[PDB]
Amino acid sequence: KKMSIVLAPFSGGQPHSGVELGPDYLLKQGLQQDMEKLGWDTRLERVFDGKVVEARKASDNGDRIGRVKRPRLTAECTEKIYKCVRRVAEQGRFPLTIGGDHSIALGTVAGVLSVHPDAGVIWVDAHADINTMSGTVSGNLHGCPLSILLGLDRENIPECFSWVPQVLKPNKIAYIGLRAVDDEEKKILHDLNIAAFSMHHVDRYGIDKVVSMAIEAVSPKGTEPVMVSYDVDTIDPLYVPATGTPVRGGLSFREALFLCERIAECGRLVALDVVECNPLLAATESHVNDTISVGCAIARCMMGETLLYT
Amino acid sequence: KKMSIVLAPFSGGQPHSGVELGPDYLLKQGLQQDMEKLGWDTRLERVFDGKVVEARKASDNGDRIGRVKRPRLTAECTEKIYKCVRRVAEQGRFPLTIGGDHSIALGTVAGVLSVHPDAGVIWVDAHADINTMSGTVSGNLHGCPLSILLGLDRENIPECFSWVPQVLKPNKIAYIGLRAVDDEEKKILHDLNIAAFSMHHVDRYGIDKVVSMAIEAVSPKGTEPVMVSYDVDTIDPLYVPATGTPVRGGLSFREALFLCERIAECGRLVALDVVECNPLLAATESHVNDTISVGCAIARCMMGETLLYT
Amino acid sequence: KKMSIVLAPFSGGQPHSGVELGPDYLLKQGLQQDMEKLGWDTRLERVFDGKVVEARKASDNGDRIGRVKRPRLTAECTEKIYKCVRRVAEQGRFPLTIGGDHSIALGTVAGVLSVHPDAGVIWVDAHADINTMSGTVSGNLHGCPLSILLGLDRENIPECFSWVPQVLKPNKIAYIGLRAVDDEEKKILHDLNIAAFSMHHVDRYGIDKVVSMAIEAVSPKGTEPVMVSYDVDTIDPLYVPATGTPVRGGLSFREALFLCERIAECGRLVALDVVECNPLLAATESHVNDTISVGCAIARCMMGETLLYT
Ligand SMILES: [Mn+2]
Ligand SMILES: [Mn+2]
Ligand SMILES: [Mn+2]
Ligand SMILES: [Mn+2]
Ligand SMILES: [Mn+2]
Ligand SMILES: [Mn+2]
């Protein structure tokens, strides 16, 4: 039980500052203690200085390629995460990455899949995060990771992303909690036949059935490793207020953690990303605690925490 | 895909002013744009001036027949809605009526059923709205539409309602979300064997099963048209605060819209009423937005909006 | 249909004052009227003066035996409740006990089981309340009733509890809503094979299935009497704010009452405790009303109240 808590305080995939504080806030609530307490030999892995990056990000408005914003900064930072997550996995340790916005998944998914080539990816998010370079309206890269990972709109992806390995295939991605998918993304999921479970399926079949369906979808031989990239805005704003792109009608606090228990129960989780926690996006310091604690709760539940004896 | 958005700014079936602002508020949030955006050729249908009606209503306290309040005003306005909804349906257009309190269902149901005689009616409400003239304690007519439509307590229904066609039979009504039914109404539903699904059934079988049961109940040949009269107070006050008769323990925001998706999916929806939105019954202008947006959301989901590709 | 509303204004099993006001507050909201209105011939049973007890409790800090706090006061008061609940049951009347903290279950369970020896016990709580004398860290007895009732850690239970009859066996206890069980309690439930249904099971199977499983677990011949000890903190703080030990991720208001309806439906409920309502633990006098009304709602639903005709 070896684990490497990968700290990825990045905010370049979006406009709001504060999300890069997630790592720090999570570790403050005792993330590592919880993990050690769960029997994991933990080690912190800092990939870069969040303060420096915020500095170079804030200033440089010239970092753009048409609609896409900060492709240079994003490509540079996510490549460091890739190298760190790749290394962590090669050493045989479990990489738990704390963001930071979802653009970091470029490095996490790339890193994990380049080591566990047949690993399935369960993307827990209210959004599809699959906007192509030409398609993205806002130009925020935290909503484009999967397009770049799947190598979509090839011709328009900046060369500064030439380092991204083409290891993710559409039949190895499964979404859970979708409810804010735009027209371009709807067509993509449909044309690529990507297993996507919206809030409609949750409401229709219940979270237990949805998780089972999601794990099956990316697990042919039913024995492949599984990775989860958890965007906290999948959970209803009621419980997860401090976040950049909230969307009403999400998972209840209970469903958010039950999902984790089912994956833990699975026994094949090989990696986990917990992203989009922006403490600076809350009114009361209570919203901040509700949010960050939910993060630590996801980590604990994913890594073994059960309500009863085990 | 022809639609007529019937504007019914009426508040005579109850005591609180503000509910007649629903139409205006809904159209402000872009109700018609959403509908056109969903592929419907829309047309607004104003049946009467909400300002004038509020004026004649406010003043005239003499409009009463024992317990029943404003039977003259209510009978006159609902007859105009009947004629408008009847006309809209005859032209082969889909009538989407925005209230206004639920007393307007006297005209909507009468209008739709006089054109589609075998149309089933799914009444989404926390209340049964079936108090008889002699039975109604409060005398508010927004809680009596179904008694008059079913022709109950015949002998005591004012003659100013003589225009109401006897087109609704008890085996063509199905309730969803019931939780505030009074003793008289409990006996009625039971003696008339009306298919009623309370929050108990939702909690017991889940919203998916309940909707299926409701659609079946009013669809013998399983091919009859279906009409939905949606009272927003069916949804828990948590999400729908600005409303005249709130009742704790309602449908979650998710269930409120999933229900709509299932009906849309059905393919036989022939009419829809969205009622009881009172913007003037909110503390923060946030309660107002939560409420009105939920209204537009019901319309979009009922009329075709899906979370994924379709 | 004879009932005895047992008033147990006790707070000695915990540190916060205010919980002893539950009885008074409940009766204020009309608890007895509701019961009579439900067809029960009610009678109030005061076992002791809540004001006097609070007085002797507040002062006496010397009432302790190591970690355990107020074992003398608790043992004395719970013995009075035992005698009262035992008497009420012998007279063939239904004992509805209103607390007061959960330490009162020492007398209720003992009283009911000494009359209905084969009665099952359904403990609705977020906590296991089974800490042993040596195990309890906080020393608060409202978290130790079941250990004493099951006669655990015998050797360390003060002799002032020598009156407690050994009538409860582990195969006659079933938990519902568990989510804050400590390590000692986890081991105990596991070693004793006690039927426990955590929020995990509720999220996984739904409340309907869980209740059925719980009733089955303590009902071998499927015809045994059933008793329910209802701790209100089983319900999510969102709905039940004013309480001593809140825990996030609980039963929704709907599940809290549906559970009651299923037990009522069962037809074998022989006793009910409603505990942990502390009015003095609320910010707005709204939290207080939300909480206390939920209490009366549990009593009504348990005792027969249905949403539709019956
Ligand atoms: Mn995301
Ligand atoms: Mn997202
Ligand atoms: Mn209504
Ligand atoms: Mn209603
Ligand atoms: Mn308890
Ligand atoms: Mn408890």
Alpha-carbon span A189 to A274, nearest angstrom: 23
Which of the residues A233, A236, A273, A305 is marked catalytic?
A: A233
Supply the DSSP symbol for B91: T
| Overall resolution, Å | 1.8
Method of structure determination:
X-ray
Q: Do C307 and B200 touch (CB under 8 A)?
A: yes
Intra-chain end-to-end CA distance of chain C, in Å? 16
3-state secondary structure of C226: strand
Min Cα separation C157/chain A (Å): 25
B183: closest chain C residue by CA: C309
List of residues 6+ apart from A61 with CB closer than 8 A = none
Bridge-based pairing state of the strands A269-275 and A94-98: parallel
Which chain A residues are Cβ-neighbours of C190 within 8 angstroms? Answer: 308-309
Question: Going by C-beta distance under 8 Å and a sequence separation of 6 or more, which residues neighbour residue B49?
Answer: none
Please name the helix (run of DSSP H) or strand (run of DSSP E) that holds residue C229, with its range, or none: strand C226-231
Q: Which two tokens stand for residue A87?
A: 């290394």
Beta carbons of C308 and B204 less than 8 Å apart: no
Domain residues for C199?
Answer: 1-310
- Nearest-5° angle of CA B167, CA B168, CA B171? 140
Give the N- to C-terminal CA distance of chain A in Å, as an integer.
Answer: 16
CA distance A151 to A137: 19
- C254 reaches A (C-beta below 8 A): no
Partner residue opposite C198 with nearest CB, options A207, A253, A307: A307
B234 Cβ under 8 Å from any chain C Cβ:
no
Cβ C189–A257 below 8 Å, yes or no? no
CA–CA separation, C27 vs C34, rounded Å? 10
| B266/B62 Cα distance (integer angstroms) | 46
Q: Do B308 and A248 touch (CB under 8 A)?
A: no
Q: Tell me if B113 sits within 8 A of B218, measured CB to CB.
A: no
Query: What does the alpha-carbon distance between residue C45 and residue C227 come to, in Å, rounded to a whole number?
Result: 19
Chain A neighbours (≥3 Cβ pairs under 8 A) are B, C
**To probe the interface with A, which of C127, C190, C204 has the most A CB atoms within 10 Å?**
C204
Q: C30 — alpha (psi -120 to 50), left (phi > 0) or beta?
A: left
Whole-angstrom distance, CA of residue A224 vs CA of residue C305:
51
Q: How far apart are CA C6 and CA C261, in angstroms?
A: 22
Using CA atoms, how far apart are residues B231 and B103, in angstroms rounded to an integer? 11
> Residue C137 in contact with residue C191, Cβ under 8 Å?
no
- Tell me the nearest-neighbour CA distance from C262 into chain A, angstroms: 21
Q: How far is the CA of B291 from the centre of ligand 3 (A)?
A: 16
CB B170 within 8 A of CB C297: no
How far apart (Å, rounded) are the C-alpha atoms in residues B100 and B295?
12
Residues C230 and C240: beta-carbon distance below 8 Å: no
Residues of chain B contacting A193 with CB distance shorter than 8 Å: none
B116 is annotated as an active-site residue: no
* Of C178, C181, C203, Cβ closest to residue A258: C203
Nearest to C27 by CA among C53, C48, C7, C12: C7
Q: How far is the CA of B231 from the centre of ligand 3 (A)?
A: 5
Give one DSSP letter per residue of A261-292, joined into a string. Answer: HHHHHHS-EEEEEEE---TTS-SSHHHHHHHH
C203 sits in which H/E element: helix C199-205
Q: Give how many domains chain C has, as a whole number.
A: 1
- Interface residue C49 vs chain B (CB under 8 A): no
Identify the CATH number of the domain in which residue C183 sits: 3.40.800.10
The stretches of B12-130 forming alpha helices (DSSP H) are 22-28, 31-37, 50-59, 71-90, 105-113
Please, are residues B184 and B132 in contact by the beta-carbon 8 Å criterion?
A: yes
Q: CB neighbours (10 Å) of residue B20?
A: 26
